[PDB]
Design a protein around this motif. Structure first.
Motif, short mmCIF file in Angstrom:
data_model
loop_
_atom_site.label_atom_id
_atom_site.label_comp_id
_atom_site.label_asym_id
_atom_site.label_seq_id
_atom_site.Cartn_x
_atom_site.Cartn_y
_atom_site.Cartn_z
N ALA A 158 21.24 -17.00 32.89
CA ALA A 158 19.92 -17.47 33.24
C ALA A 158 19.94 -18.59 34.26
O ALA A 158 18.88 -19.13 34.59
N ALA A 216 14.31 -17.73 34.01
CA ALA A 216 15.27 -17.77 32.90
C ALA A 216 14.74 -17.01 31.69
O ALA A 216 15.47 -16.23 31.06
N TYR A 221 17.68 -18.81 21.73
CA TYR A 221 17.75 -19.43 23.04
C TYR A 221 16.56 -19.01 23.89
O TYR A 221 15.97 -19.85 24.59
N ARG A 236 20.89 -21.57 33.84
CA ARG A 236 20.42 -22.77 33.15
C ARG A 236 21.63 -23.66 32.91
O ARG A 236 22.15 -23.78 31.81
N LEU A 265 24.89 -17.11 27.78
CA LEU A 265 23.50 -16.78 28.08
C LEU A 265 22.90 -17.73 29.12
O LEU A 265 22.25 -17.30 30.08
N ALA A 266 23.10 -19.04 28.93
CA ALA A 266 22.63 -20.02 29.90
C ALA A 266 23.18 -19.74 31.29
O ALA A 266 22.46 -19.88 32.28
N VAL A 291 15.22 -13.28 32.16
CA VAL A 291 16.61 -12.89 31.94
C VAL A 291 16.90 -12.78 30.45
O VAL A 291 17.46 -11.79 29.98
#
Ligand SMILES: [Mg+2]
Ligand SMILES: [Mg+2]
Ligand SMILES: [Mg+2]
Ligand SMILES: [Mg+2]
Lengths: 235, 6, 235, 6
Positions: free
Chosen positions: C21, A63, A89, C23, C17-18, A66
């Protein structure tokens, strides 16, 4: 901590269940609790500990990469300004990753390494110490040099013990060499050292295969193929 | 292809 | 809660973004924070919310099934007694899964559904309500019947609106039917209803494909293939 | 082969 009321054996049993369910955060928490009981770990238990945290930190590292890539692109010429969110983040994920690395290093320092006297356990734990300092080094941007040298020092102590006390085909010795070689290549800016170490490790294991059973041969050749893959990639 | 660690 | 100090737009940016990734726990927390800002969600935002929680609860459900299977085997004739750990750990995962379902249902009840007036949003949210009551039903063993009927009731309201207000090729209508069909098959013990619903939904969408653009055709036929796969599996 | 939900 939260696992203080659970039996050691129950924590190990639940770690194995968590592994089957691919619940690696749970698995890591169970094995942390088992370590904190204060008794030394068996070979199988050491591998449960490493499998758990390797999977947790592996996801965090993927993560982070990325997000770090998005962040770098956002600082290229002509990129539209999007505010602080990417950096924030990335920092959040980075901080959680560092926390996991610190947790593992803390377990090794209190008190796994100092109680580990056999070559198999001591080398395993020092490889882990080197690995988690290396993961800290991957994200480090005043202390980077000291983090790098802490990884190097742990790996070097493990290498010294492994060469003296273990056969060249020992899977822990081979995996230690694999990882220290990658450290040289992509952390220490020493690709020639990385290549030399991988090739020497491979050749010395090749010459010892004849001493092994079928099962040990499969174990050793599996890791030897990882060394060969890296050499092929790097040359 | 990415390098291996274990 | 913890996201109360972050801008709505920043939460949505970080949710995206998460997602990149992988996430998904972070993604879900960001979208929960966005919902709690109190404004209605756009189409894209509704899909970020659903993607996040579907992935979180999906992992929990898969883990629960692994553990429930181990537990059932441990109660077979001739299984060696291993103590309470399997049950305990299944219960732990079950409780966390129920908590996630309760969180989603709470967002829908405060106050996504009551503010949703367009067919696209209302049907989307009622499908979600049915889905998360269905996940509760999967692990339920006094309230199972009421949990099942809450899923059914949400799905039925969504079906009624979708048939009145949406074309038969609408991807939300198709996915609602897909899931309500699975509810019939494996929750409500009504495989004939499941098969009838899937086949009717498929046939009515097939007959409307001619009205669609190339892009809409791809969107609809993708979900139609999921209906067909289920029919093939069930017949 | 397992049934689909989405
Ligand atoms: Mg005890
Ligand atoms: Mg000792
Ligand atoms: Mg604002
Ligand atoms: Mg409205």
């Amino acid at each position: 901590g939260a696992m203080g009321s659970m039996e050691r054996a129950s924590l190990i049993q639940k770690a194995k269940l968590a592994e089957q369910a691919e619940r690696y955060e749970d698995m890591a928490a169970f094995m942390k609790g088992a370590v904190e009981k204060g008794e030394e770990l068996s070979c199988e238990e050491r591998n449960l500990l490493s499998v758990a945290y390797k999977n947790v930190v592996g996801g965090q590292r993927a993560a982070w990469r990325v997000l770090s890539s998005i962040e770098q692109k956002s600082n290229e010429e002509g990129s539209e300004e999007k505010g602080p969110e990417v950096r924030e983040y990335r920092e959040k994920v980075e901080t959680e990753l560092q926390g996991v690395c610190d947790t593992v290093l803390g377990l090794l320092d209190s008190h796994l390494i100092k109680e580990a006297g056999d070559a198999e356990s001591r080398v395993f734990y020092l490889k882990m110490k080197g690995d988690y300092y290396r993961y800290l080094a991957e994200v480090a941007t005043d202390d980077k040099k000291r983090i790098i040298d802490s990884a190097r020092s742990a790996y070097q102590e493990a290498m010294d013990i492994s060469k003296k006390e273990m056969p060249p085909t020992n899977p822990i010795r081979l995996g230690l060499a694999l990882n220290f070689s990658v450290f040289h290549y992509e952390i220490a800016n020493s690709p020639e050292e990385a290549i030399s170490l991988a090739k020497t490790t491979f050749d010395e294991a090749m010459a010892d295969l004849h001493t092994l059973s079928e099962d040990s041969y499969k174990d050793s050749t599996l890791i030897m193929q990882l060394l060969r893959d890296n050499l092929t990639l790097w040359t | 292809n990415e390098r291996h660690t274990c």
